[PDB]
Design an enzyme around this catalytic site. Sequence first.
Site, PDB file in Angstrom:
ATOM      1  N   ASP A  22       0.788  -1.241   0.000  1.00 39.18           N
ATOM      2  CA  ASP A  22       0.000   0.000   0.000  1.00 39.18           C
ATOM      3  C   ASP A  22       0.820   1.291   0.000  1.00 39.18           C
ATOM      4  O   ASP A  22       1.441   1.613   1.003  1.00 39.18           O
ATOM      5  CB  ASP A  22      -0.955  -0.073   1.211  1.00 39.18           C
TER       6      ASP A  22
ATOM      7  N   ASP B 286      -2.500   5.515  -5.121  1.00 38.71           N
ATOM      8  CA  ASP B 286      -2.737   4.554  -4.043  1.00 38.71           C
ATOM      9  C   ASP B 286      -2.937   3.082  -4.486  1.00 38.71           C
ATOM     10  O   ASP B 286      -4.042   2.685  -4.845  1.00 38.71           O
ATOM     11  CB  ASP B 286      -3.932   5.042  -3.202  1.00 38.71           C
TER      12      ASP B 286
HETATM   13  C1  3ZK Z   1      -6.026  -2.851  -4.501  1.00 37.84           C
HETATM   14  O1  3ZK Z   1      -6.146  -3.899  -3.528  1.00 37.84           O
HETATM   15  C2  3ZK Z   1      -5.872  -3.457  -2.192  1.00 37.84           C
HETATM   16  C3  3ZK Z   1      -6.944  -4.022  -1.236  1.00 37.84           C
HETATM   17  C4  3ZK Z   1      -8.306  -3.329  -1.469  1.00 37.84           C
HETATM   18  O2  3ZK Z   1      -9.260  -3.711  -0.461  1.00 37.84           O
HETATM   19  C5  3ZK Z   1      -9.468  -3.047   0.763  1.00 37.84           C
HETATM   20  C6  3ZK Z   1      -8.761  -1.890   1.173  1.00 37.84           C
HETATM   21  C7  3ZK Z   1      -9.053  -1.305   2.415  1.00 37.84           C
HETATM   22  C8  3ZK Z   1      -8.304  -0.047   2.802  1.00 37.84           C
HETATM   23  O3  3ZK Z   1      -9.052   0.923   2.785  1.00 37.84           O
HETATM   24  N1  3ZK Z   1      -6.956   0.054   3.034  1.00 37.84           N
HETATM   25  C9  3ZK Z   1      -6.380   1.381   3.388  1.00 37.84           C
HETATM   26  C10 3ZK Z   1      -6.392   2.453   2.258  1.00 37.84           C
HETATM   27  C11 3ZK Z   1      -5.472   2.176   1.055  1.00 37.84           C
HETATM   28  N2  3ZK Z   1      -4.406   3.198   1.080  1.00 37.84           N
HETATM   29  C12 3ZK Z   1      -4.415   3.822   2.411  1.00 37.84           C
HETATM   30  C13 3ZK Z   1      -5.920   3.851   2.725  1.00 37.84           C
HETATM   31  N3  3ZK Z   1      -6.642   4.913   2.038  1.00 37.84           N
HETATM   32  S1  3ZK Z   1      -7.272   6.211   2.791  1.00 37.84           S
HETATM   33  O4  3ZK Z   1      -8.065   6.959   1.845  1.00 37.84           O
HETATM   34  O5  3ZK Z   1      -7.947   5.802   3.987  1.00 37.84           O
HETATM   35  C14 3ZK Z   1      -5.806   7.134   3.171  1.00 37.84           C
HETATM   36  C15 3ZK Z   1      -4.875   7.414   2.164  1.00 37.84           C
HETATM   37  C16 3ZK Z   1      -3.733   8.183   2.466  1.00 37.84           C
HETATM   38  C17 3ZK Z   1      -3.529   8.692   3.761  1.00 37.84           C
HETATM   39  C18 3ZK Z   1      -2.282   9.526   4.086  1.00 37.84           C
HETATM   40  C19 3ZK Z   1      -4.478   8.424   4.756  1.00 37.84           C
HETATM   41  C20 3ZK Z   1      -5.615   7.650   4.464  1.00 37.84           C
HETATM   42  C21 3ZK Z   1      -6.114  -1.167   3.148  1.00 37.84           C
HETATM   43  C22 3ZK Z   1      -4.820  -1.355   2.304  1.00 37.84           C
HETATM   44  C23 3ZK Z   1      -5.945  -1.519   4.653  1.00 37.84           C
HETATM   45  C24 3ZK Z   1     -10.093  -1.810   3.218  1.00 37.84           C
HETATM   46  C25 3ZK Z   1     -10.787  -2.964   2.831  1.00 37.84           C
HETATM   47  C26 3ZK Z   1     -10.495  -3.577   1.585  1.00 37.84           C
HETATM   48  O6  3ZK Z   1     -11.221  -4.685   1.095  1.00 37.84           O
HETATM   49  C27 3ZK Z   1     -12.213  -5.362   1.891  1.00 37.84           C
END
Ligand code: 3ZK
Length: 336
Positions: free
Chosen positions: A37, A222
């Site tokens: 990520d 991202d």
């Molecule tokens: C593409 O395949 C990846 C798997 C996708 O599936 C999923 C992903 C998730 C998910 O949200 N994440 C976290 C996100 C991805 N980047 C970070 C964060 N984005 S955010 O906007 O909050 C952010 C961006 C930047 C900052 C500074 C602060 C906050 C994962 C990695 C924990 C949850 C459930 C999923 O499925 C059930």
Amino acid sequence: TLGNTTSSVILTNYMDTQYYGEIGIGTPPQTFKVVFDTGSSNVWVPSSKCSRLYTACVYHKLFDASDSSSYKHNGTELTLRYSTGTVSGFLSQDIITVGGITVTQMFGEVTEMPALPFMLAEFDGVVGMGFIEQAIGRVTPIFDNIISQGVLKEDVFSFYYNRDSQSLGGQIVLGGSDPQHYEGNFHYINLIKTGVWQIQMKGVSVGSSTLLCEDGCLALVDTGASYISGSTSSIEKLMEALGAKKRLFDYVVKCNEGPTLPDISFHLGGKEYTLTSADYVFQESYSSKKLCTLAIHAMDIPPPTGPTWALGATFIRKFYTEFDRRNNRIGFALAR
Ligand SMILES: COCCCOc1cc(C(=O)N(C[C@@H]2CNC[C@H]2NS(=O)(=O)c2ccc(C)cc2)C(C)C)ccc1OC
Ligand SMILES: *[C@@H]1O[C@H](CO)[C@@H](O)[C@H](O)[C@H]1NC(C)=O
């Protein structure tokens, strides 16, 4: 220090929404399915210390420190807040194996994992590919610890996300890029500032006319996000321009009207990055009696990072991405 090595991690593509690979933590290694990520800077996996009343922990691989001879206690509390949910636990240190590279790393042992969204997760944890600046508890990110070893050919890493099929789900290359998965040449955009994988965006067009981001906006690249996302406001305008209906957590079109939807272009650096309806519509059928989800949703990312757009798997599938730590830039090339 620069070496002459590149390592690679094969990724699994689950239904075009989740991409993850494997890492090994401890001695002997305990394997985890993790998301690499760029939108986060911490390493975390579910812990054996997670209360089994959190059903997500019953359904994921848990790290047990009592079974690792290389484990080093730390104990500092850690809370990781995402726009999708929150996880908390404590810091631990151990040996992590990532595509051949062995590194002593500080990571979070998650003890609080909410069912929404982690019961929907195919992966167990996260390997944050972001900068130390956004690392919770100021913990050194894994890529910084890999650079320190002076083994990588270049201070870069790149992502390939394939379209779902039984073939290669995707690939991360640490230390370089793989020319077998892109064609043409990389077009680079410098980061607005070091510390975040965020670049300036100068317009989003629906069809021929620049309907959005006219006076400029931000684009977080991202790898941990499934979709292309914008703020509630931008997405409302975009969806009205497409003729989409809002539901609880997504936007839909009648399946028969999916192929007829206009191209969406993202103005980044030199070039226009165009996605056709085939690149952003989950075309499950062509029925006039069925609804089709779009691979674009609203996500209000909080400041200082947000308000911002996020270019997730929807975008990376079309465009092979190189994250350049040496020059604080991101390169895009048409994926093969
Ligand atoms: C593409 O395949 C990846 C798997 C996708 O599936 C999923 C992903 C998730 C998910 O949200 N994440 C976290 C996100 C991805 N980047 C970070 C964060 N984005 S955010 O906007 O909050 C952010 C961006 C930047 C900052 C500074 C602060 C906050 C994962 C990695 C924990 C949850 C459930 C999923 O499925 C059930
Ligand atoms: C935990 O690790 C940090 C470094 O990330 C260190 O500074 C701190 O002293 C450690 N705490 C304990 C209790 O070992």
